[PDB]
Design a protein around this ligand. Structure first.
Ligand SMILES: Nc1ncnc2c1ncn2[C@@H]1O[C@H](COP(=O)(O)OP(=O)(O)OP(=O)(O)O)[C@@H](O)[C@H]1O
Ligand SMILES: Nc1ncnc2c1ncn2[C@@H]1O[C@H](COP(=O)(O)OP(=O)(O)OP(=O)(O)O)[C@@H](O)[C@H]1O
Ligand SMILES: Nc1ncnc2c1ncn2[C@@H]1O[C@H](COP(=O)(O)OP(=O)(O)O)[C@@H](O)[C@H]1O
Ligand SMILES: [Mg+2]
Ligand SMILES: [Mg+2]
Lengths: 393, 28, 50, 130, 219, 395
């Protein structure tokens, strides 16, 4: 029928199972009020419901929000629309200082006498809010081993002015404000993107390249404005592009009736990158697989300065990436990896990790608790034979 | 096949009403 | 430059709007203004927009 | 100079031919013929594709092309592409008779034409026979 | 009436735009190319006409337009949308620039990379009067540009720019600026303060971006 | 509800036996404390007294608004039915946890304060694309694979049904699986068979329907597909027929094909670029395998590649049996007349035979089954293949 996998297998299980059933049967025995078409459970608003709600009824107001057009002289005398109600000439209430009421500002205005009470943060549409990352993944610089030249070049540019604005002052230079990354795939482009977004000390902003192509004209450009407007507010922010071939590579005009709307969007990226009132503290990283069919307006330095390529390292990066991926698993102490790397001369780090995840499958092809070296021998026995007579290769 | 489009607007109507028992002098 | 009072000029590109009607509504008003004053001249450069 | 070439000589990426298969599908349309022997005698069946009532029909001979005193043929495909082949195959059978003074056997006459039809598929980029 | 810049995309066109706006004191007014393209129809004809009315109120005024090829395009048999608002705003730009009701109180500067897209109506002689090409720096301008950007940096005074300008082949003003920037950091790698001829020569090897090796079967 | 977050022994260690029995003690005693509330002071304090305090606190006419943005803790911005927007404070009566932007609310008259939330409907996109129920036959339908069955089971099912072995060695399961082979093999069958016997949600996508005559909608449908698949449930995303929509950059042209390039470029990033999607199973099916873009073929995206061959005389004897399992069979027929003879024809051809014999019999209004039914049906399926074949004699 069945058997014990480890000793008291059901004996810990139903002890856990009925008490989760009992945590239910507590609540209906106490009386639980759930699913009451959009309310709160009663155990925490019964001591909220009384007169410190009337403290939100009678002292608080409605404060209808608006938008500012301009100011006047000697006095505020502000001209303001609501949204579609009426445009008014109104005044601030006395609870503000007439300093941060600059033009083009969403502000809240009293409903009765039409006076300004609260300045509000501006309208950021959610489609670019969902590309600000707001968290940072756990990727260490040590995890991208095998790239001693490439990380060192990229350390010099993205990291060091943002954390040491001293040496560049004392010598009098300007850092190369934009870097392109390229190479064969699966090599470590996205790893370095995550690893810099780890230690950023900045407002790292993700951009997927094909999120700009849309159905209407000009709205794809209107994204790029809102990016570089938040960039000038969030001082010293990073912007990562990825697969910039969708943003535009050519200016096909022999039969100029094909792609045009991506060209207009790509020209808007050109102007707000460099030209007429520079950006200050913004660094741009790009990453593509074919850096050959791009527009040479991007290839102009000032915009894209360093061309860092990612190769298949030699023989010792593979041994080190082995020591990155096969440090973190449960193996035998009889490791060796110069034997392993000489068996796979042409391979990516993705193909390295694919072997290490394949190696754990053989222990689960078997019924083991561990990863044996001879099992990992048998893991590297198949994947040599697997990669010799692979379907695509 | 790869063809963009513009747009348009259909603005809603608006109407207001009151109890209309308010006098508008107060001057004099 | 002869009349200087009874001459209507239209760029034929600012006629468009964001609403659905409202571009015809200019044209009805134009000819009706051209109906009221009797010897009127209409000039629309660059029709190729409209 | 180089971008105007049609490349009717390269194999397909499947590993087969690419232009001959386009040619062989033209034979199935515009013509229907057959022949049957099992004893002394042999027949040929033809079909008038254009049977309009203002033609002369004064040739008093047709698709059956008597190419020898012992052989004839029935052709289907591009019409005047045959007239190159019928005049050529008629002379191969006749230069054989000049060489040996003996009528041409029916086997090796067919091999003489099939070496000509292959030669346009082998090299050149010349359009093959349909 | 109107001055046009054109040339290769690194010869310096935004420079004289920013430079003369820096020197003069009139109302300088910027304008990009794709700013006139909007979502709804109209809205460039609204936008161009409101732009020039702002220039009339502040009568010493100069308007700069960049990437004019984004809106200036030779028309043809086009369908659907896309172009079917772009030429409409473009014609409004032509009319509000030149022709009916002329003015002398606004000056227009434009700059593109490619010329052959543009209408003859834009280039006519009265919409854009003077046509100014920008050539690539020949020999001595490359020596001149690299001297300009070497101002702040600590240069060892045994450096011939004419040796540099003869070995910086087929660069533009942006690339000659980039060689000067990279040569400072290469000295920062080994911690040297001043520069050398080798520092610039290694910067040239980086900007040219020599890819690979084993090219040894020559000579 | 979120009573204790610790699971870290994850075995038959004595630690979990101690911790969960502590949780048994703190819950029994909380119950036995509160059981002695309805025993000695069994009062009904808040049946209507909580309600009539609040139903009188809110207005009797309720008005539905719409969230726009959320500011610090109590005041957010809303939108009325016409567009008039109000900077009103919410109360501690509404679930603040299911309060995301783009949701309907309940408002007040004088202060217009947010009083309650209205629950949402079901999105139509699930009802479009999800095979909702267990559709079709189980593993009694399949004809003798037993190795291809074994690979898909330990890649999807055994990771999902019994996750305990991967978390012993800490090794993540492989992500992507390609199904490929000659057409008519059973690629759609094996997807639906796993869709039959499953525990998570399944999503079927025909790849040819990802080409819009508008533009930008290619990447738009992709970025919403995995968005729904992530937000809904444990999910298995199956996309049939990616071979003729995502092949390679064959000439780098424009005018539509450049748009198709952009759709696959979004799909490539939406598959795997950033913030590993989690509990998302991707299964892809092709006929051809060679003309595929190798940036999709690389590991990190797809790790399993499974050949689908054609058996000759062994599994067919059940495929001919299963397709004739629900029909009559007169005694004049032998399946070995056709199984032993030809060795290449697909399982789809077998279904084409086993339906045509049912067509030939009832067209002539006859009884059960003849041998000449299977004779003429096999002859027909030859012409069903051969009449679309341009092959002459040895190419
Ligand atoms: N040098 C390396 N060291 C450690 N891991 C690596 C290395 N190269 C690749 N990998 C592994 O391979 C996977 C793929 O890396 P990455 O995502 O950077 O590829 P990519 O460059 O983004 O591919 P593409 O060019 O197709 O976008 C990563 O998850 C990483 O774990
Ligand atoms: N002749 C020059 N003298 C000095 N600096 C120059 C020269 N030409 C280019 N530069 C450098 O080039 C940068 C500006 O680039 P440039 O003005 O060529 O862009 P553009 O041609 O106006 O626009 P685009 O790059 O879009 O074509 C400046 O930082 C400037 O230092
Ligand atoms: N092993 C099998 N057992 C039963 N039926 C099969 C088998 N193989 C193929 N078939 C039949 O052939 C069809 C196979 O579908 P499939 O090969 O997935 O089509 P495609 O590969 O073109 O998507 C099914 O309808 C099924 O009835
Ligand atoms: Mg990547
Ligand atoms: Mg410029």
């Amino acid at each position: 029928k069945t058997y014990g996998q480890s000793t008291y297998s059901r004996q810990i299980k139903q002890v856990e199972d009925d008490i989760q059933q009992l945590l239910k049967k507590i609540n209906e025995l106490t009386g639980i009020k759930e699913s009451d078409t959009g309310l709160a459970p009663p155990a925490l608003w019964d001591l909220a419901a009384d007169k410190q709600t009337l403290q939100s009824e009678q002292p608080l107001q409605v404060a209808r929000c608006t938008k500012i057009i301009n100011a006047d002289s000697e006095d505020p005398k502000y001209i303001i629309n609501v949204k579609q109600f009426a445009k008014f000439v109104v005044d601030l209430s006395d609870q503000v200082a007439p300093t941060d009421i600059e033009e083009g500002m969403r502000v809240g205005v009293d409903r009765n006498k039409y006076q300004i009470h609260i300045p509000l943060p501006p309208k950021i549409d959610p489609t670019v809010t969902m590309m600000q990352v707001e968290e940072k993944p756990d990727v260490t610089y040590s995890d991208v081993g095998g790239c001693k030249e490439q990380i060192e070049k990229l350390r010099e540019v993205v990291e060091t002015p943002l954390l040491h604005p001293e040496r560049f002052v004392n010598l009098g230079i300007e850092p190369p404000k934009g870097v392109l990354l390229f190479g064969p795939p699966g090599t470590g482009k996205t790893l370095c993107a995550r690893a810099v977004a780890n230690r950023t000390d900045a407002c790292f902003i993700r951009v997927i390249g094909s999120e700009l192509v849309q159905k209407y004209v000009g709205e794809g450009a209107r994204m790029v404005r809102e990016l570089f407007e938040m960039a000038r507010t969030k001082k010293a922010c990073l912007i990562f592009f990825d697969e910039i071939d969708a943003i535009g590579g050519a200016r096909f005009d022999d039969g100029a009736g094909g792609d045009n709307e991506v060209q207009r969007t790509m020209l808007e990226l050109i102007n707000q990158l460099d030209g007429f009132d520079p950006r200050g503290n913004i660094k741009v990283l790009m990453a593509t697989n074919r850096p050959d069919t791009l527009d040479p307006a991007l290839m102009r330095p000032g915009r894209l300065d360093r061309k860092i390529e990612f190769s298949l390292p030699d023989l010792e990066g593979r041994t080190h990436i082995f020591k990155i991926h096969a440090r973190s698993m449960s193996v035998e102490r009889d490791i060796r990896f110069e034997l392993l790397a000489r068996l796979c001369p042409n391979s990516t780090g993705a193909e390295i990790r694919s072997v290490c995840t394949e190696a754990g499958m053989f222990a689960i092809r078997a019924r083991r608790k561990i990863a044996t070296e001879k099992d990992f021998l048998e893991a590297v026995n198949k994947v040599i034979k697997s990669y010799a007579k692979f379907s695509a290769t | 096949x790869x063809x963009x489009x513009x747009x348009x607007x259909x603005x809603x109507x608006x109407x207001x009403x009151x109890x209309x028992x308010x006098x508008x002098k107060x001057x004099x | 430059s002869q009349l200087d009072c009874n001459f209507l000029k239209v760029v034929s590109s600012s006629i468009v709007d964001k609403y659905i009607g409202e571009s015809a509504r200019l044209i009805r008003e134009m000819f009706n203004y051209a109906r009221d004053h009797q010897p009127c001249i209409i000039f629309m450069d660059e029709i190729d927009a409209i | 100079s180089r971008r105007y070439d049609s490349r009717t000589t390269i194999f397909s990426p499947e590993g087969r031919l690419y232009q001959v298969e386009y040619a062989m599908e033209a034979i199935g349309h515009a013509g229907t013929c057959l022949g049957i022997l099992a004893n002394d005698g042999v027949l040929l069946a033809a079909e008038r594709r254009n049977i309009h009532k203002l033609l002369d029909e004064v040739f008093f001979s047709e698709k059956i092309y008597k190419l020898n005193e012992d052989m004839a043929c029935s052709v289907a495909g591009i019409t005047s592409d045959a007239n190159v082949l019928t005049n050529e195959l008629r002379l191969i059978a006749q230069r054989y008779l000049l060489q040996y003074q003996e009528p041409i056997p029916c086997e090796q006459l067919v091999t003489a034409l099939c070496d000509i039809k292959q030669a346009y598929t082998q090299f050149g980029g010349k359009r093959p026979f349909g | 009436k109107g001055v046009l810049m054109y040339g290769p995309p690194g010869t310096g066109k935004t420079l004289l735009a920013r430079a003369c706006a820096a020197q003069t004191k009139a109302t300088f007014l910027k304008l990009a190319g794709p700013q006139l393209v909007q979502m709804f129809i109209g809205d460039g004809a609204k936008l161009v006409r409101d732009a020039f009315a702002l220039a009339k109120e502040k009568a010493p005024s100069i308007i700069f337009i960049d990437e004019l090829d984004a809106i200036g395009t030779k028309r043809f048999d086009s369908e659907k949308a896309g172009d079917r608002e772009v030429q409409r705003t473009m014609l409004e730009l032509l009319n509000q620039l030149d022709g009916f009701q002329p003015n002398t109180q606004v000056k227009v500067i434009a700059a593109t990379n490619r010329v052959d897209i543009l209408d003859p109506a834009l280039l006519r002689s009265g919409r854009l009067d003077r046509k100014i090409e920008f050539p690539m720096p020949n020999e001595e301008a490359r020596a001149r540009i690299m001297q300009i950007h070497s101002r702040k940096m600590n240069v060892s005074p045994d450096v011939n720019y004419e040796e540099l300008a003869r070995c910086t082949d087929d660069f533009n003003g942006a690339q000659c600026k980039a060689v000067c920037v990279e040569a400072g950091m290469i000295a920062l790698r080994r911690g040297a303060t001043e520069l050398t001829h080798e520092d610039y020569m290694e910067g040239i090897l980086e900007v040219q971006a020599k890819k690979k090796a084993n090219l040894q079967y020559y000579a | 509800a979120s009573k204790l977050p610790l699971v870290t022994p994850h075995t038959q260690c004595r630690l979990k036996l101690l911790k969960l029995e502590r949780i048994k003690d703190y819950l029994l005693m909380e119950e036995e404390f509160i059981r002695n509330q309805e025993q000695m002071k069994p009062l009904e304090e808040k049946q209507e007294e909580e309600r009539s305090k609040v139903d009188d606190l809110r207005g009797t006419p309720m008005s539905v608004g719409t969230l726009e943005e959320i500011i610090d803790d109590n005041h957010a911005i809303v939108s009325t039915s016409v567009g008039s927007e109000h900077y009103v404070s919410i109360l501690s009566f509404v679930d603040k946890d299911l309060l995301e932007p783009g949701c309907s609310v309940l408002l007040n008259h004088k202060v217009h304060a947010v009083i309650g939330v209205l629950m949402d409907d079901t999105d139509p996109l699930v009802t479009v694309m999800k095979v909702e129920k267990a559709p079709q036959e189980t593993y009694a339908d399949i004809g003798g694979l037993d190795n291809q069955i074994q690979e898909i089971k330990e890649s999807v099912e055994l990771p999902l049904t019994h996750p305990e072995y991967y978390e012993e060695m800490g090794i993540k399961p492989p992500k992507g699986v390609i199904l490929y082979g000659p057409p008519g093999t059973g690629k759609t069958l094996l997807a639906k068979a796993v869709a039959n016997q499953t525990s998570a949600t399944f999503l079927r996508v025909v790849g040819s329907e990802l080409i819009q005559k508008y533009l930008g909608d290619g990447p738009k449908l992709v970025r919403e597909l995995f968005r729904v698949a992530e937000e809904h449930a444990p999910s298995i995303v199956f996309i049939d027929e990616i071979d003729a929509i995502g092949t390679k950059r064959y000439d780098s042209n424009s005018g539509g094909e450049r748009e198709i390039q952009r759709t696959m470029l979004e799909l490539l990033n939406q598959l795997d670029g950033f913030d590993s999607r989690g509990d998302v199973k991707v299964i892809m099916a092709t006929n051809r395998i060679e003309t595929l873009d190798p940036a999709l073929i690389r590991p990190g995206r797809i790790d399993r590649k499974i050949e689908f061959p054609l058996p000759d005389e062994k599994t067919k004897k059940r495929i001919f049996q299963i397709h004739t399992s629900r029909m009559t069979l007169a005694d004049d027929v032998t399946l070995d007349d056709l199984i032993m003879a030809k060795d290449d024809l697909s399982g789809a051809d077998i279904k084409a035979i086993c339906t045509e014999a049912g067509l030939m019999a009832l067209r002539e209004r006859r009884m059960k089954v003849t041998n000449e039914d299977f004779k003429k049906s096999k002859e027909n399926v030859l012409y069903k293949k051969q009449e679309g074949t341009p092959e002459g004699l040895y190419l």
